[PDB]
From a paper:
Cluster of differentiation-22 (CD22) belongs to the sialic acid–binding immunoglobulin (Ig)-like lectin family of receptors that is expressed on the surface of B cells. It has been classified as an inhibitory coreceptor for the B-cell receptor because of its function in establishing a baseline level of B-cell inhibition. Genetically modified T cells with chimeric antigen receptors (CARs) derived from the m971 antibody have shown promise when used as an immunotherapeutic agent against B-cell acute lymphoblastic leukemia. The CD22 ECD is composed of seven Ig-like domains (d1–d7) and contains 12 predicted N-linked glycans.
The antigen–antibody structure was solved by molecular replacement using the m971 Fab as an initial search model, which was derived from its 1.6 Å resolution crystal structure in complex with the crystallization chaperone anti-kappa VHH domain. Comparison of the variable domain of the CD22-liganded and -unliganded crystal structures of m971 Fab indicated that its paratope is largely preconfigured for binding its epitope (RMSD of 0.33 Å). Interestingly, the m971 paratope contains a basic patch in HCDR2.
Numbering used by the authors:
A (entry chain K): 1 to 120
B (entry chain H): 1 to 35, 35A, 35B, 36 to 52, 52A, 52B, 53 to 82, 82A, ...
C (entry chain L): 0 to 213
Write the structure that this text describes.
Amino acid sequence: XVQLXXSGGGXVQXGXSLXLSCXAXXXXXXXXXXXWXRQXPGXXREXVXXXXXXXXXXXXXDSXXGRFTXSXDXXXXXXXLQXXXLXXXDXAXYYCXXXXXXXXXXXXXXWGXGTXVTVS
Amino acid sequence: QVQLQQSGPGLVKPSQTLSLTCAISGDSVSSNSAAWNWIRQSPSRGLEWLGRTYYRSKWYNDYAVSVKSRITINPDTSKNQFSLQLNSVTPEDTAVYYCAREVTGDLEDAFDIWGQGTMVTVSSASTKGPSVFPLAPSSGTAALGCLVKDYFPEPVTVSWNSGALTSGVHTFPAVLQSSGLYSLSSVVTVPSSSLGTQTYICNVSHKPSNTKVDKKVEP
Amino acid sequence: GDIQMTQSPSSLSASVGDRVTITCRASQTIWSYLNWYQQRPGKAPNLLIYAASSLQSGVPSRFSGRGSGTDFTLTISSLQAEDFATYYCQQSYSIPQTFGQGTKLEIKRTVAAPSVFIFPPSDEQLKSGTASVVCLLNNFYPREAKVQWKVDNALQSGNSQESVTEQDSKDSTYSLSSTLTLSKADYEKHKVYACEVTHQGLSSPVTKSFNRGE
């Protein structure tokens, strides 16, 4: 059983910044990739970024490359998404998910409840 | 006997066009004592009249102001049907859409015949068909069922023994899982004595994905 | 809209055999141009009464309607279990035609404590990498209940969801499902799975449990 809790969402104007956090409880995040996704009303749940295990790198979606940065703090069992140079199109609920597959296939069994980001 | 049969996809991408069709049996789309209506229903806004088409020596339309700039309701006399076209949809258009016959006569102005409804979800996500797993009866009355997991969009329907089993069936409303996909279960209680001799098969249908699956549920 | 239809009460519970009357008021006069509908779960609204007081063909005679102008009523003379439904009024006086917000009629009945069942995940689901553990509370009344998951005798939170049926049209009960979802790896890290059920009709909670792999 894993419980994920996102926070750090809110309202910002274009060009602004936010930092999201995703705190995990009940298993270590150290052994698994952690991903960020986002969903705006009417749209598919879109991949944003993944932080794999330490030394296995971070990867990003085209839409956020060079503006968002994913990072991990294994000791705090928490991952972060630094979001810079925000634009209206970034408005969405942001979700974190743990990849249950050690091989990084993205078996996303556990999802957070989401935190709302609005850029206006 | 007058019947209305609805058809059309229940998934529409944002900014694209919703298109549904209502085929009439037992009456004429040109009847001068009826009007052919579309009404939608959502949890947030209730029942909302959308518009109508009707023939009185000439074809007429009335539309709700809020959708008039996007809506078209046209008859097809050759096929004896009428259509709904709603352009540039947004999530505010997610709803169950019904067609209905409005009797318009001396003693009555009412919606007396309704289509079965089409659940329309405005989303750019792709369809996903469900997986069906058994809820096996445990080792008097016994409970068994089927778990219908990970589908999109709504709805799925479930029957038991191709409709022959109805007593004691409970099919739960779908739940939106944290992944954004839906699941539901359907259960039935039966005599525990009946387990080794009677067969129980759940029939699962997910029309958006053209999925049909039977699952025998055994101890 | 333009003419607003306001129904009252928004919901109510009444017992089989009760006389039930619900009210629909129009924001301006609609004379006789008022209809009543019954909507059962999963179904289109069904016309009960047209022109304020005319009973639609095939509708049981226990249904009746009265009124004119701005104030209308719908009456069920002797409620039956299958009358569980949402009831709507609708004006056809002028465009746009508009509906009331509905009256949700629950059938009140005697208290029935739930029968509880627990289901382990299927082998096929486990093969796919996930485990769904299902707890079923069957045929109970009233609707309120508490379902807690205990895994290896430890209370859980955050990995379960519930769904409740609409009221049954024959015995007026509810059923409820609680589903605990784990990854396959996590499911295989525990032995005892238990569902604990509390309901006003139970003197103390009821638990159903299984040991994984038995």
